[PDB]
């Protein structure tokens, strides 16, 4: 029984997409939604939705929306899933095993890859602990690969967490950028703010 709609085009079609360690989040509510168009949009090559089939999702009501977007290398996409392993999953961003929502992704070689390499996207290969579900704890401490306390100084057994990526049009598809958005729905017993079009 609401009037407001969400700027899905403004949020998604926006060129600015974050990295993986500092992925960007949006809290969407009070909005009349239409995801059928986004579904057939196809642009987002990937479509894996968990907890609901995307077809019945359209008319559904949702308590709140979290859109988490970033750009990823081609081969690492499989590491993003509920209950999934991988260097990103265990070291950049971990999904809950109970994740409800859908992961969508598009290439963007023509947008995010440069022949000189677009190293604006960093990845934390090194962490002191594994990643909890929905954990964005941006820590750049120089990890001490050896027994000597590095004291934040590189050198013998003193490596850095964030390594950049060589996103180029010359890159392989598995080594090329991909614009990825995950939609998470906390369908708790809280009244829904976003719904589908029916009386």
């Amino acid at each position: 029984n609401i009037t407001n709609l969400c700027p899905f085009g403004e949020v998604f079609n926006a060129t600015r997409f974050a990295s993986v360690y500092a992925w960007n989040r949006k809290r969407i509510s009070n909005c009349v939604a239409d995801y059928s168009v986004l579904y057939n949009s196809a642009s987002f090559s990937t479509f894996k939705c968990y907890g609901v089939s995307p077809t019945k999702l359209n008319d559904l009501c949702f308590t709140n929306v979290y859109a988490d977007s970033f750009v990823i290398r081609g081969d690492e996409v499989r590491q993003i899933a509920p209950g999934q392993t991988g260097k990103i999953a265990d070291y950049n961003y971990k999904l809950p095993d109970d994740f409800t929502g859908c992961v969508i992704a598009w290439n963007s070689n023509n947008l995010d890859s440069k022949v000189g390499g677009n190293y604006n996207y960093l990845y934390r290969l090194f962490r002191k602990s594994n990643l909890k579900p929905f954990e964005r704890d941006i820590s750049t401490e120089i990890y001490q690969a050896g027994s000597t306390p590095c004291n934040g100084v590189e050198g013998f057994n003193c490596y850095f967490p964030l390594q950049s990526y060589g996103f180029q049009p010359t890159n392989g598809v598995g080594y090329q950028p991909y614009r990825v958005v995950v939609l998470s729905f906390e369908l708790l017993h809280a009244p829904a703010t976003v719904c589908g079009p029916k009386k």
Partner: nanobody
Framework: QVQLQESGGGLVQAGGSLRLSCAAS????????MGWFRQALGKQREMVAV???????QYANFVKGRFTITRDNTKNTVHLQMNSLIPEDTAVYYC?????????WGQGTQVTVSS
């Protein structure tokens, strides 16, 4: 759309000194972490220092003990003073803003030193 205003580069002989600066004029949610990365022609990105507003140092060994960083908490600007310059150190440097939501970048300050 946070903007990272960079200035303080140029041409300097061997052993000289310059003073870079980057300023985050955007939202800057919560505390930030303001950094410098270097990229020479034909090479990838290497982090000079990822000093935070609070602590944690994060100095590299490449120019260990020659560059320094100062915090100005009034305007949340960060100034990078370079001393005893060498041709190897010279490259293009971008300011960095970690922020709480996502990361941003500078637009470039050329550093060239030779004799």
């Amino acid at each position: 759309q946070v903007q990272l205003q960079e200035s303080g580069g140029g041409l300097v002989q061997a052993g000289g000194s310059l003073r870079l600066s980057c300023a985050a004029s955007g939202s800057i949610f919560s505390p930030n972490t303001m950094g410098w990365f270097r990229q020479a022609l034909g090479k990838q990105r290497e982090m000079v220092a990822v000093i935070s507003s609070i602590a944690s140092t994060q100095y590299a060994n490449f120019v260990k003990g020659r560059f320094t960083i100062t915090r100005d908490n009034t305007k949340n600007t960060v100034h990078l003073q370079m001393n005893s310059l060498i041709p190897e150190d010279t490259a293009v440097y971008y300011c960095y803003a970690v922020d709480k939501s996502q990361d941003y970048w500078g637009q470039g300050t050329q550093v060239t030193v030779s004799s």
